[PDB]
């Protein structure tokens, strides 16, 4: 038993991380097959970031301007191209440690593991969620750009995130591996508005189910509610509305605990209106929304890779 | 910026994990050089665990009773011996993926990463602390025994924990890699008392320092206090007393923030007596004690491996 915010094992990704340097900018890159992916702002100076013209800047760079370094093994760039906001550095050597991988664009509310890197070297791994406003609340210092987020399913690494920038508000924004930003942000040093950050209701429900599984049931009540009535209260507390798709996804947790989704909604409703009275659930005094229903099932069944 | 409960990258350890089977018990083992380490209760049945005589049970087992499996590669046991509560299985093949490693016995309040495994396969990685009562609050399902905890310093893996048992209270107990239990527990299925679980005060202080670094400073006040006066209040709230050794360890955080240790103690004192008023610090409504001063420095300076 027990419940922890658990990250995927990072071994398969550690062996894909490289240091990319262009001029005096050094950040992290993702080396898969004979290609290296990295944020395109590696080519900018500090002055450039205020208002970069990436096409103009990229034309004054040649293949030999990019220094890719994998441990003490230098790679040779024999082709470069810009795809959206990522630079694709074609190199002479295919990474022998390339895993079975794919690129996926995740939806808000989904979780993934982040391997924080500096100078192409792993530093730490943590689990986080894509917020509904398409930001993440990570831990990134300068030179972490190029760090990637990922999920593992069986033997296949799903890369879903590349870190690009920290907003003046201290939250983090990045792209998928095709270079398309999550959210309306752009890779330029300017004030950019993130939208309201709402709470991922379906994830809260999965976490409450995890609590019941681990013996925390003080919050249960025999009240019930309707999906419409619940959403009216959820909307007022900046909780994402719940849909029938969310109810379906929680079915397996409903079956294992004998507690209907709408009954659990009624217990959450009470918590929002009356608070936690200084009590806790799974060691937390706040409602947690960084566990998907799949995460809970995964951790309460014992899945390996 | 930002602050996360961050685990070490687990790659170096993933390649050391193997499945050990003896009779009908299968759990995880640690394969380093030509030796496999695993909990000695692998040799027990369910009935045996109530009152095991490990010397008697180990004599009815021979080298060929142990099935060590590393992926699809079977290892051959050519020698076995019991060291305290761990079984050492000497095998014919040295692990080519053996890292630079050492065995260390950690003190309460220190943190380490856990690689949760099942059938010798990694499942997830999380960061936790050794509680002052020598338990850990992990996430373990049956068959996780043999999972290990570890720290990484530069290139060297420090193995510090091997999981053995879940107590009837839902907390977790295990040994160092020499087979000596942390705490007064024994590997037998009986009611065992864990002591009072106190809060790791020095870690709370480091976390509050991390908060100030990341812009959360509402809890600061210009009051001060004495080490003796602080400990009087800490003792009442089941907080570990603070010593001069703890003050010294926090010096570097004191210097970077311009806030004396005793001033920060005064701010914590107020929090214990008056609570958090529903506010939060670094996204938490509770005082966090699973970050050592070294963890905070590591995460706020950008250390790699």
Coordinates of C-alpha atoms in Angstrom, one line a residue:
Chain A
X1 CA 0.0 0.0 0.0
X2 CA 0.9 3.7 0.2
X3 CA 0.7 6.4 -2.5
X4 CA 3.4 8.5 -4.0
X5 CA 3.8 11.0 -6.8
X6 CA 5.8 8.6 -9.0
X7 CA 7.8 9.2 -12.1
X8 CA 8.6 6.8 -14.9
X9 CA 12.1 5.3 -14.8
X10 CA 14.3 7.6 -16.8
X11 CA 17.0 5.2 -18.0
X12 CA 15.8 5.0 -21.6
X13 CA 15.8 8.8 -21.9
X14 CA 19.1 9.5 -20.1
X15 CA 20.9 7.9 -23.0
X16 CA 19.3 10.2 -25.5
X17 CA 20.3 13.5 -23.9
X18 CA 23.1 15.6 -25.5
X19 CA 24.6 19.1 -25.1
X20 CA 24.0 21.4 -28.1
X21 CA 26.0 24.6 -28.4
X22 CA 25.6 27.3 -31.0
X23 CA 27.8 30.3 -30.6
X24 CA 27.7 31.0 -26.8
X25 CA 24.4 29.4 -26.1
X26 CA 24.5 25.8 -24.7
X27 CA 21.3 23.9 -23.9
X28 CA 20.1 20.3 -24.0
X29 CA 19.1 18.3 -27.1
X30 CA 17.3 15.0 -27.7
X31 CA 19.4 12.5 -29.8
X32 CA 17.2 9.9 -31.5
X33 CA 18.5 8.0 -34.5
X34 CA 20.7 10.3 -36.6
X35 CA 18.8 13.5 -35.5
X36 CA 19.1 15.9 -32.6
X37 CA 16.1 18.0 -31.5
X38 CA 16.6 21.2 -29.5
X39 CA 14.8 24.5 -29.0
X40 CA 15.5 26.8 -31.9
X41 CA 16.4 29.7 -29.6
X42 CA 19.8 28.1 -29.0
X43 CA 20.8 30.3 -32.0
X44 CA 19.8 33.5 -30.3
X45 CA 21.9 35.8 -28.0
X46 CA 20.4 37.5 -25.0
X47 CA 19.7 40.6 -27.1
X48 CA 18.1 38.5 -29.8
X49 CA 15.5 37.0 -27.5
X50 CA 13.7 40.3 -27.2
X51 CA 12.5 40.2 -30.8
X52 CA 14.0 37.4 -32.8
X53 CA 13.7 36.9 -36.6
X54 CA 14.5 33.2 -36.6
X55 CA 14.6 32.8 -40.4
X56 CA 17.1 35.7 -40.7
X57 CA 19.2 34.3 -37.7
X58 CA 19.2 30.8 -39.0
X59 CA 20.6 31.8 -42.4
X60 CA 23.8 33.2 -40.9
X61 CA 24.5 29.8 -39.3
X62 CA 26.0 26.9 -41.1
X63 CA 26.3 23.2 -40.2
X64 CA 29.6 23.7 -38.5
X65 CA 28.3 26.4 -36.1
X66 CA 26.5 23.7 -34.0
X67 CA 28.6 21.8 -31.4
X68 CA 26.7 18.6 -30.4
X69 CA 28.4 16.8 -27.5
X70 CA 27.3 13.4 -26.2
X71 CA 29.5 12.7 -23.2
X72 CA 33.0 13.0 -24.6
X73 CA 31.8 12.0 -28.1
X74 CA 31.4 14.8 -30.5
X75 CA 28.7 14.5 -33.2
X76 CA 29.0 16.1 -36.6
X77 CA 26.2 18.1 -38.1
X78 CA 25.6 17.3 -41.8
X79 CA 22.2 18.9 -42.1
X80 CA 20.0 21.3 -40.2
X81 CA 16.4 22.5 -40.6
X82 CA 13.8 24.4 -38.6
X83 CA 10.5 22.6 -37.9
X84 CA 8.2 25.1 -36.2
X85 CA 10.0 26.0 -32.9
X86 CA 12.5 23.1 -32.8
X87 CA 15.8 22.8 -34.7
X88 CA 16.5 19.4 -36.2
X89 CA 20.3 18.7 -36.4
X90 CA 21.0 15.9 -38.7
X91 CA 24.2 14.2 -37.5
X92 CA 26.5 11.4 -38.9
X93 CA 26.0 8.9 -36.1
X94 CA 22.7 7.2 -35.2
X95 CA 22.3 6.9 -31.4
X96 CA 23.0 3.2 -30.6
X97 CA 20.9 3.8 -27.4
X98 CA 17.8 4.9 -29.3
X99 CA 14.7 3.4 -27.7
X100 CA 11.4 2.5 -29.3
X101 CA 9.8 5.9 -29.3
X102 CA 7.1 8.0 -30.7
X103 CA 6.1 11.7 -30.6
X104 CA 2.7 12.5 -29.1
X105 CA 0.9 15.8 -28.4
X106 CA -0.9 15.4 -25.0
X107 CA -4.0 17.1 -23.9
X108 CA -4.4 19.3 -20.8
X109 CA -4.8 17.4 -17.6
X110 CA -2.5 14.5 -18.7
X111 CA 0.6 13.7 -16.7
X112 CA 4.1 13.0 -17.8
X113 CA 7.6 12.7 -16.3
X114 CA 10.2 15.4 -16.8
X115 CA 14.0 14.6 -17.0
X116 CA 15.6 17.9 -16.0
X117 CA 19.0 18.3 -17.6
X118 CA 21.9 20.8 -17.7
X119 CA 24.7 20.7 -20.3
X120 CA 23.2 17.5 -21.7
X121 CA 23.5 15.7 -18.3
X122 CA 20.5 14.4 -16.3
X123 CA 19.9 16.2 -13.0
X124 CA 16.6 14.8 -11.7
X125 CA 13.2 13.4 -12.6
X126 CA 9.8 14.4 -11.5
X127 CA 6.1 13.9 -12.4
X128 CA 3.8 16.8 -13.4
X129 CA 0.6 17.6 -15.2
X130 CA -0.1 19.7 -18.2
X131 CA -2.3 22.4 -16.7
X132 CA -5.6 23.4 -18.4
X133 CA -3.9 26.7 -19.5
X134 CA -1.1 24.7 -21.2
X135 CA 1.6 25.7 -18.7
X136 CA 3.5 23.4 -16.4
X137 CA 4.7 24.1 -12.9
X138 CA 8.2 22.5 -13.1
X139 CA 11.6 23.1 -11.7
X140 CA 13.9 24.7 -14.3
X141 CA 17.1 26.7 -14.0
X142 CA 18.8 28.5 -16.9
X143 CA 20.3 26.0 -19.3
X144 CA 17.5 23.4 -18.6
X145 CA 15.9 24.3 -22.0
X146 CA 15.7 21.2 -24.1
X147 CA 14.8 19.0 -21.2
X148 CA 12.0 16.7 -22.3
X149 CA 8.8 15.2 -20.8
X150 CA 7.8 11.6 -21.5
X151 CA 5.6 8.7 -20.8
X152 CA 6.6 5.0 -21.0
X153 CA 4.1 2.3 -22.1
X154 CA 5.6 -1.2 -22.1
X155 CA 8.8 -0.7 -24.2
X156 CA 7.8 2.5 -26.0
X157 CA 8.9 6.0 -24.9
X158 CA 6.3 8.6 -25.8
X159 CA 8.0 12.0 -26.0
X160 CA 5.4 14.7 -25.4
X161 CA 7.2 17.9 -24.2
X162 CA 10.3 19.9 -24.7
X163 CA 11.0 22.8 -22.4
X164 CA 11.6 26.2 -24.0
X165 CA 10.9 29.2 -21.7
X166 CA 10.0 30.4 -18.2
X167 CA 7.3 33.1 -18.1
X168 CA 7.7 36.2 -16.0
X169 CA 5.1 34.6 -13.7
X170 CA 7.4 31.7 -12.9
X171 CA 5.5 29.0 -14.8
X172 CA 6.9 27.0 -17.7
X173 CA 6.0 26.7 -21.4
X174 CA 7.2 24.4 -24.1
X175 CA 6.4 22.5 -27.3
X176 CA 5.7 19.0 -28.5
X177 CA 8.5 17.3 -30.4
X178 CA 7.1 18.7 -33.7
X179 CA 7.9 22.2 -32.5
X180 CA 4.4 23.3 -31.9
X181 CA 3.9 25.2 -28.6
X182 CA 1.4 24.1 -26.0
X183 CA -0.9 27.1 -25.5
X184 CA -0.7 30.4 -27.2
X185 CA 2.9 31.2 -26.3
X186 CA 5.8 32.0 -28.5
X187 CA 9.6 31.7 -28.0
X188 CA 10.4 35.4 -27.4
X189 CA 11.2 37.3 -24.3
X190 CA 8.0 39.3 -23.9
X191 CA 5.1 39.5 -21.4
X192 CA 2.7 36.7 -22.3
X193 CA -0.6 36.0 -20.6
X194 CA -1.4 32.6 -19.3
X195 CA -5.1 32.0 -18.8
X196 CA -6.9 31.0 -15.7
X197 CA -5.4 27.8 -14.2
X198 CA -8.4 25.6 -13.3
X199 CA -8.3 22.4 -11.2
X200 CA -8.4 19.1 -13.1
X201 CA -11.6 17.6 -11.6
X202 CA -11.3 14.2 -13.2
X203 CA -7.8 13.8 -11.7
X204 CA -9.1 14.9 -8.2
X205 CA -11.7 12.2 -8.4
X206 CA -9.2 9.5 -9.3
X207 CA -7.0 10.6 -6.4
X208 CA -10.0 10.4 -4.0
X209 CA -10.5 6.9 -5.3
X210 CA -6.8 6.2 -4.5
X211 CA -7.4 7.5 -1.0
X212 CA -10.3 5.1 -0.4
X213 CA -8.2 2.2 -1.7
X214 CA -5.5 3.2 0.9
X215 CA -7.8 3.4 3.8
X216 CA -8.7 7.2 3.9
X217 CA -12.5 7.3 3.8
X218 CA -13.5 10.0 6.3
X219 CA -14.6 12.2 3.4
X220 CA -17.2 9.8 2.1
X221 CA -20.9 10.6 2.6
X222 CA -24.1 9.0 1.5
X223 CA -25.3 12.1 -0.2
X224 CA -25.4 11.9 -4.0
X225 CA -25.7 14.5 -6.8
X226 CA -26.3 15.0 -10.5
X227 CA -23.6 15.7 -13.1
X228 CA -25.3 19.1 -13.8
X229 CA -25.6 20.1 -10.1
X230 CA -22.0 19.1 -9.5
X231 CA -20.8 21.2 -12.4
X232 CA -22.6 24.2 -11.1
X233 CA -20.6 24.0 -7.9
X234 CA -17.4 23.0 -9.7
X235 CA -17.6 26.0 -12.0
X236 CA -17.7 28.4 -9.0
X237 CA -14.5 27.0 -7.5
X238 CA -12.6 27.1 -10.8
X239 CA -12.9 23.3 -11.3
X240 CA -13.0 22.0 -14.9
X241 CA -16.5 20.7 -15.6
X242 CA -17.0 16.9 -15.7
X243 CA -18.3 15.1 -18.8
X244 CA -19.7 11.7 -19.5
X245 CA -16.3 10.8 -21.0
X246 CA -14.8 11.5 -17.6
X247 CA -17.4 9.3 -15.9
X248 CA -16.6 6.4 -18.3
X249 CA -12.8 6.7 -17.6
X250 CA -13.4 6.4 -13.9
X251 CA -15.5 3.2 -14.3
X252 CA -12.8 0.8 -13.3
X253 CA -12.1 2.7 -10.1
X254 CA -15.8 2.8 -9.4
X255 CA -16.0 -1.0 -9.8
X256 CA -13.0 -1.8 -7.6
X257 CA -14.2 0.3 -4.7
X258 CA -18.0 -0.2 -5.0
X259 CA -18.5 3.6 -5.0
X260 CA -20.4 5.2 -7.9
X261 CA -18.8 8.2 -9.7
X262 CA -21.8 10.4 -8.8
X263 CA -21.5 9.4 -5.1
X264 CA -17.8 10.4 -5.1
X265 CA -18.8 13.7 -6.9
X266 CA -21.1 14.4 -3.9
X267 CA -18.2 13.9 -1.5
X268 CA -16.0 16.3 -3.5
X269 CA -18.9 18.8 -3.6
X270 CA -18.9 18.9 0.2
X271 CA -15.1 19.3 0.4
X272 CA -15.2 22.4 -1.9
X273 CA -18.0 24.0 0.1
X274 CA -16.8 23.1 3.6
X275 CA -13.1 22.6 3.2
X276 CA -11.0 19.9 4.8
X277 CA -11.3 21.2 8.4
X278 CA -7.5 20.9 8.8
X279 CA -7.8 17.2 8.1
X280 CA -5.7 15.5 5.4
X281 CA -6.2 13.0 2.5
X282 CA -3.2 10.8 1.6
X283 CA -0.9 13.1 3.6
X284 CA -2.1 16.2 1.8
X285 CA -4.1 19.2 3.1
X286 CA -5.0 20.2 -0.4
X287 CA -6.9 18.4 -3.2
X288 CA -4.4 16.9 -5.6
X289 CA -5.0 16.9 -9.4
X290 CA -1.7 15.6 -10.8
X291 CA -2.8 11.9 -10.9
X292 CA -4.9 10.8 -13.9
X293 CA -7.2 7.8 -13.5
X294 CA -4.7 5.8 -15.4
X295 CA -1.9 6.8 -13.0
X296 CA -4.0 5.6 -10.0
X297 CA -4.8 2.3 -11.7
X298 CA -1.1 1.9 -12.7
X299 CA 0.2 2.5 -9.1
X300 CA -2.5 0.4 -7.4
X301 CA -2.0 -2.6 -9.7
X302 CA 1.8 -2.8 -10.1
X303 CA 2.7 -2.2 -13.8
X304 CA 6.2 -2.6 -15.1
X305 CA 8.1 -1.7 -18.3
Chain B
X1 CA 12.7 28.8 -10.9
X2 CA 10.1 26.4 -9.4
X3 CA 10.4 23.7 -6.8
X4 CA 9.6 20.0 -7.2
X5 CA 10.1 16.8 -5.2
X6 CA 12.7 15.5 -7.5
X7 CA 14.3 12.0 -7.7
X8 CA 17.7 11.1 -9.0
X9 CA 17.8 9.7 -12.6
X10 CA 17.4 5.9 -12.2
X11 CA 19.2 4.7 -15.3
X12 CA 22.3 3.4 -13.5
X13 CA 20.1 1.3 -11.2
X14 CA 17.6 0.0 -13.7
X15 CA 20.4 -2.1 -15.3
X16 CA 21.1 -3.7 -11.9
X17 CA 17.6 -5.0 -11.1
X18 CA 16.9 -8.8 -11.5
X19 CA 14.1 -11.2 -10.7
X20 CA 15.0 -13.7 -8.0
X21 CA 12.8 -16.8 -7.5
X22 CA 13.2 -19.5 -4.8
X23 CA 10.5 -22.1 -4.8
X24 CA 7.2 -20.1 -5.4
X25 CA 8.4 -16.8 -4.0
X26 CA 9.6 -14.2 -6.6
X27 CA 11.0 -10.8 -5.7
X28 CA 13.5 -8.3 -6.9
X29 CA 17.3 -8.5 -6.5
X30 CA 20.2 -6.2 -7.0
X31 CA 22.9 -7.5 -9.4
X32 CA 26.3 -5.9 -8.8
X33 CA 29.5 -7.5 -10.1
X34 CA 29.0 -11.3 -9.8
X35 CA 26.7 -11.0 -6.8
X36 CA 22.9 -10.7 -6.4
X37 CA 21.5 -9.2 -3.2
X38 CA 17.9 -9.8 -2.2
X39 CA 15.7 -10.1 1.0
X40 CA 16.3 -13.4 2.7
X41 CA 12.6 -14.0 3.1
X42 CA 12.5 -15.0 -0.5
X43 CA 13.1 -18.5 0.8
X44 CA 10.0 -18.5 3.0
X45 CA 6.4 -19.6 2.2
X46 CA 3.4 -17.7 3.4
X47 CA 3.2 -20.0 6.4
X48 CA 6.9 -19.6 7.1
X49 CA 6.7 -15.9 7.6
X50 CA 4.7 -16.2 10.8
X51 CA 7.8 -17.6 12.7
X52 CA 10.7 -18.3 10.4
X53 CA 13.9 -20.1 11.4
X54 CA 16.1 -18.7 8.6
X55 CA 19.1 -20.9 9.4
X56 CA 17.0 -24.1 9.3
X57 CA 15.2 -23.0 6.1
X58 CA 18.4 -22.0 4.3
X59 CA 20.0 -25.4 4.9
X60 CA 17.2 -27.2 2.9
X61 CA 18.0 -25.0 -0.1
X62 CA 20.9 -25.6 -2.6
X63 CA 22.4 -23.3 -5.2
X64 CA 20.1 -24.7 -7.9
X65 CA 17.0 -23.8 -5.9
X66 CA 17.4 -20.1 -6.8
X67 CA 16.3 -18.8 -10.3
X68 CA 17.9 -15.5 -11.0
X69 CA 16.6 -13.9 -14.2
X70 CA 17.9 -10.7 -15.8
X71 CA 15.6 -9.9 -18.7
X72 CA 15.7 -13.1 -20.8
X73 CA 19.2 -14.0 -19.5
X74 CA 19.3 -16.6 -16.8
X75 CA 22.2 -16.4 -14.2
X76 CA 23.6 -19.4 -12.5
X77 CA 24.1 -19.5 -8.8
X78 CA 27.5 -21.0 -7.8
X79 CA 27.4 -19.8 -4.2
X80 CA 25.0 -18.5 -1.6
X81 CA 25.4 -17.1 1.9
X82 CA 23.2 -15.2 4.4
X83 CA 24.5 -11.8 5.6
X84 CA 22.2 -10.6 8.4
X85 CA 18.8 -10.2 6.6
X86 CA 20.0 -10.3 3.0
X87 CA 20.9 -13.3 0.8
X88 CA 24.0 -13.0 -1.3
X89 CA 23.7 -15.1 -4.5
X90 CA 27.1 -15.6 -6.1
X91 CA 26.6 -16.0 -9.8
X92 CA 28.8 -16.9 -12.8
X93 CA 28.4 -13.6 -14.7
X94 CA 29.5 -10.2 -13.6
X95 CA 26.9 -7.5 -14.5
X96 CA 28.5 -5.6 -17.4
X97 CA 26.2 -2.6 -16.4
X98 CA 27.6 -2.4 -12.9
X99 CA 28.1 1.2 -11.9
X100 CA 30.6 2.8 -9.6
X101 CA 28.7 2.1 -6.4
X102 CA 29.1 1.9 -2.6
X103 CA 27.0 0.8 0.3
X104 CA 26.1 3.4 2.9
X105 CA 23.9 3.3 6.0
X106 CA 21.9 6.6 6.1
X107 CA 20.7 8.4 9.2
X108 CA 17.1 9.4 9.9
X109 CA 16.0 12.6 8.1
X110 CA 18.1 11.9 5.1
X111 CA 16.5 11.5 1.7
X112 CA 16.9 9.0 -1.1
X113 CA 15.3 7.9 -4.3
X114 CA 13.4 4.6 -4.5
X115 CA 13.1 2.6 -7.7
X116 CA 10.0 0.5 -7.2
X117 CA 10.2 -2.8 -9.1
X118 CA 8.1 -5.9 -9.7
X119 CA 9.5 -9.2 -11.1
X120 CA 12.9 -7.5 -11.6
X121 CA 11.4 -4.7 -13.8
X122 CA 11.4 -1.0 -12.9
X123 CA 7.9 0.4 -12.3
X124 CA 8.5 4.0 -11.1
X125 CA 10.8 6.2 -9.1
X126 CA 10.1 8.6 -6.2
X127 CA 11.9 10.5 -3.6
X128 CA 11.3 10.0 0.1
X129 CA 12.9 10.5 3.5
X130 CA 14.0 8.1 6.3
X131 CA 11.6 9.0 9.1
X132 CA 13.0 9.5 12.6
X133 CA 11.4 6.3 13.6
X134 CA 13.3 4.4 10.9
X135 CA 10.3 3.8 8.7
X136 CA 9.5 5.1 5.2
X137 CA 6.2 6.1 3.7
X138 CA 6.6 4.6 0.3
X139 CA 4.4 3.0 -2.3
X140 CA 4.9 -0.8 -2.4
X141 CA 2.7 -3.7 -3.6
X142 CA 3.3 -7.3 -3.0
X143 CA 6.4 -8.4 -5.0
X144 CA 8.1 -5.0 -4.6
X145 CA 10.4 -6.5 -1.9
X146 CA 14.0 -6.1 -3.1
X147 CA 13.4 -2.7 -4.5
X148 CA 16.3 -0.4 -3.5
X149 CA 16.8 3.2 -2.4
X150 CA 19.8 5.1 -3.6
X151 CA 21.6 8.5 -3.9
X152 CA 23.8 9.6 -6.8
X153 CA 26.9 11.8 -6.3
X154 CA 28.7 12.6 -9.5
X155 CA 29.3 9.1 -11.0
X156 CA 28.9 7.0 -7.9
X157 CA 25.6 5.2 -6.9
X158 CA 25.2 5.1 -3.1
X159 CA 22.8 2.2 -2.3
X160 CA 21.3 2.8 1.1
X161 CA 18.0 0.9 1.4
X162 CA 16.4 -2.4 0.4
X163 CA 12.7 -2.9 0.9
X164 CA 11.6 -5.9 3.0
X165 CA 8.2 -5.6 4.6
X166 CA 5.1 -3.6 5.1
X167 CA 3.9 -3.1 8.7
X168 CA 0.3 -3.6 9.7
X169 CA 0.1 0.2 10.0
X170 CA 0.9 0.6 6.3
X171 CA 4.4 2.0 6.7
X172 CA 7.5 0.4 5.2
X173 CA 10.7 -1.1 6.7
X174 CA 13.9 -2.4 5.2
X175 CA 17.6 -2.8 5.6
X176 CA 20.9 -1.3 4.4
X177 CA 22.7 -3.4 1.8
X178 CA 24.7 -5.2 4.6
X179 CA 21.3 -6.7 5.7
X180 CA 20.9 -4.7 8.9
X181 CA 17.4 -3.4 9.5
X182 CA 16.8 0.3 9.9
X183 CA 15.0 0.5 13.3
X184 CA 14.1 -2.3 15.7
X185 CA 12.2 -4.3 13.2
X186 CA 12.7 -8.0 12.1
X187 CA 11.7 -9.8 8.9
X188 CA 8.8 -11.8 10.4
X189 CA 5.0 -11.4 10.1
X190 CA 4.2 -10.2 13.5
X191 CA 2.8 -7.0 15.1
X192 CA 5.8 -4.6 15.5
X193 CA 5.7 -1.2 17.1
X194 CA 7.0 1.8 15.2
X195 CA 7.9 4.8 17.5
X196 CA 6.5 8.3 17.4
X197 CA 7.1 9.8 13.9
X198 CA 8.5 13.3 14.5
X199 CA 8.9 16.1 12.0
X200 CA 12.4 16.6 10.6
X201 CA 12.9 20.2 11.7
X202 CA 16.1 20.9 9.8
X203 CA 14.5 19.8 6.6
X204 CA 11.5 22.1 7.2
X205 CA 13.9 25.0 7.6
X206 CA 15.7 24.2 4.3
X207 CA 12.3 24.1 2.6
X208 CA 11.3 27.5 4.0
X209 CA 14.6 28.8 2.6
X210 CA 13.7 27.3 -0.7
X211 CA 10.4 29.1 -0.5
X212 CA 12.1 32.5 0.0
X213 CA 14.3 31.8 -2.9
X214 CA 11.3 31.1 -5.1
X215 CA 9.4 34.3 -4.0
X216 CA 7.2 33.0 -1.2
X217 CA 8.0 35.2 1.8
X218 CA 4.7 36.0 3.4
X219 CA 5.7 33.9 6.4
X220 CA 8.8 36.0 7.3
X221 CA 8.6 38.1 10.4
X222 CA 11.2 40.3 12.1
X223 CA 10.9 38.4 15.4
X224 CA 13.8 36.3 16.5
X225 CA 14.3 33.6 19.0
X226 CA 16.9 31.5 20.8
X227 CA 17.8 27.9 20.0
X228 CA 16.6 26.8 23.5
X229 CA 13.3 28.8 23.2
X230 CA 12.7 27.4 19.8
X231 CA 13.3 23.8 20.9
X232 CA 10.8 24.2 23.7
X233 CA 8.1 25.0 21.2
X234 CA 9.3 22.4 18.7
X235 CA 9.2 19.6 21.3
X236 CA 5.5 20.3 22.0
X237 CA 4.6 19.9 18.4
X238 CA 6.6 16.7 17.9
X239 CA 9.4 18.4 16.0
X240 CA 12.9 17.1 16.3
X241 CA 15.1 19.4 18.4
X242 CA 17.6 21.6 16.5
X243 CA 21.3 21.5 17.3
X244 CA 24.3 23.6 16.4
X245 CA 25.2 21.0 13.8
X246 CA 21.9 21.8 12.0
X247 CA 22.6 25.5 12.2
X248 CA 26.0 25.0 10.6
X249 CA 24.5 22.9 7.8
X250 CA 22.0 25.7 6.9
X251 CA 24.8 28.3 6.7
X252 CA 25.0 28.4 2.9
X253 CA 21.2 28.9 2.7
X254 CA 21.5 31.7 5.3
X255 CA 24.2 33.4 3.3
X256 CA 22.4 33.2 -0.1
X257 CA 19.1 34.7 1.3
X258 CA 20.5 37.1 3.9
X259 CA 18.3 35.5 6.6
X260 CA 19.8 34.2 9.7
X261 CA 18.9 30.7 10.9
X262 CA 17.5 31.9 14.2
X263 CA 15.3 34.5 12.4
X264 CA 13.9 31.7 10.2
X265 CA 13.4 29.6 13.4
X266 CA 11.2 32.5 14.7
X267 CA 9.1 32.4 11.5
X268 CA 8.6 28.6 11.9
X269 CA 7.8 29.0 15.6
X270 CA 4.9 31.3 14.6
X271 CA 3.6 28.9 11.9
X272 CA 3.4 26.1 14.5
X273 CA 1.5 28.2 17.0
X274 CA -0.8 30.0 14.6
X275 CA -0.9 27.7 11.6
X276 CA -1.0 28.6 7.9
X277 CA -4.4 30.3 7.9
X278 CA -5.3 28.4 4.8
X279 CA -2.4 30.0 3.0
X280 CA 0.2 27.9 1.2
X281 CA 4.0 27.7 0.8
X282 CA 5.4 26.4 -2.4
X283 CA 2.0 25.0 -3.3
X284 CA 1.6 23.1 -0.1
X285 CA -0.8 23.7 2.8
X286 CA 1.5 21.6 5.1
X287 CA 5.1 22.0 6.3
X288 CA 7.3 19.8 4.2
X289 CA 10.2 17.9 5.7
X290 CA 11.4 15.6 2.8
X291 CA 14.0 18.0 1.5
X292 CA 17.4 18.1 3.2
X293 CA 19.5 21.3 3.1
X294 CA 21.6 19.5 0.5
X295 CA 18.6 18.8 -1.7
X296 CA 17.5 22.4 -1.7
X297 CA 21.0 23.6 -2.6
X298 CA 21.2 20.9 -5.3
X299 CA 17.9 21.9 -6.9
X300 CA 18.6 25.7 -6.6
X301 CA 22.1 25.5 -8.2
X302 CA 21.6 22.9 -11.0
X303 CA 23.8 19.9 -10.2
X304 CA 24.2 17.1 -12.8
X305 CA 25.7 13.6 -12.8

